Amino acid sequence: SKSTAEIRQAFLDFFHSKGHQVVASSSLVPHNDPTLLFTNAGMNQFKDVFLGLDKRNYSRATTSQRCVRAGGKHNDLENVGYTARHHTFFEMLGNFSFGDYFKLDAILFAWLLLTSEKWFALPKERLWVTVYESDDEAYEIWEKEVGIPRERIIRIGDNKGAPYASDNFWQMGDTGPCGPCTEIFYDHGDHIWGGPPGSPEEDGDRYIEIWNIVFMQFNRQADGTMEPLPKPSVDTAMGLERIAAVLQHVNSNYDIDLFRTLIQAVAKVTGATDLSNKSLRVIADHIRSCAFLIADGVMPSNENRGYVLRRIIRRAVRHGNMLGAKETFFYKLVGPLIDVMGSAGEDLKRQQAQVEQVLKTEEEQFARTLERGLALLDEELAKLSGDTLDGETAFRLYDTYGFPVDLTADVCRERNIKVDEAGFEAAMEEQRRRAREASGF
């Protein structure tokens, strides 16, 4: 089968052969978008093009974009290690039409790449599609132009409980380009639990969301109002790791060549032997987001972007502790990561030494309190009555030991214990009040 690198290249080659300008992945950190924490989609760097404020010499483009979804509008941090399909860091394969072609040709390009004997040659019978309920045009295209049996065409409305809140209406954020979208799913088969989209078991890993095709139509305002974009446009987005799993005949993202090799490296540096333990998958994911974020300029801190990075690093170190790592390990994974990322890791390779040092320092810094904090947490959980850790304890771990509340929640979740978030926040607010009283005017 094709390697992840070969699949990445083949996608770009396909769209390049179809007249699309190949554009390099943007950084994970925008310089000119105050609404955006980290790059969460291939379309981010073309935001102003969709808005009609930025003109390019090309009207169609294709990219393999590095993304991090660990905060802001799209945040999958808490899914990592619990599903076979969610990462913090991942690559999004995209083609874009800037007032060029529209619905029919977008769908045709995607179907051709996925199912043509000349290309990916996926079995058509295992592919399902969803459309926005009101998008009769998209329904007709799939039914009559492509020829998907009606039983595998699913209409999805505002299923997230609010106007435009839907799996079939894609938004960059609370503001920005958005529109109805159509998605392509692949059935991994009855050896995996789950039902098709729209079904009660839709959240299972059986029917995997592979490719989202967004018909960009509006710019969302802060008030929630939709203002039409000057030209209806196309934003498509396919998870590289997810399509790689399909093409390499495996079911989990973590079973692709890239992750198999990376997980081996994690086992090596932690001294773990059970290659199936979920902590290995968590660490493998976390080194990708952490290393690339640092390569793109993020430094660990207690504020904004730096704190998200700090939180992920510390959670990774914690998982390493659970596996029995006896020495500083996380930075040792940068090399192995560079080795599996191919051309997509060039910015990381360029800054290998710097990234390694940042991660080493951060782990060493956290090690000053990690085991001591875990000891306290164990002590508190041992005598805890009920299914919820009190906010005061969570706050003490935060204030004394440098445990972000989500790191504490992560440890507790593994023992079916919740954290009183309201209590933690009350404790933080109480401390802020003390600070104001002491500092004065």
Ligand SMILES: NCC(=O)NS(=O)(=O)OC[C@H]1O[C@@H](n2cnc3c(N)ncnc32)[C@H](O)[C@@H]1O
């Ligand atoms: N602009 C349009 C758009 O963004 N659309 S989409 O939001 O739906 O993400 C595009 C695709 O990236 C994959 N994907 C999304 N999130 C993750 C994740 N956390 N981990 C792994 N793969 C993911 C998945 O294949 C998804 O269909």
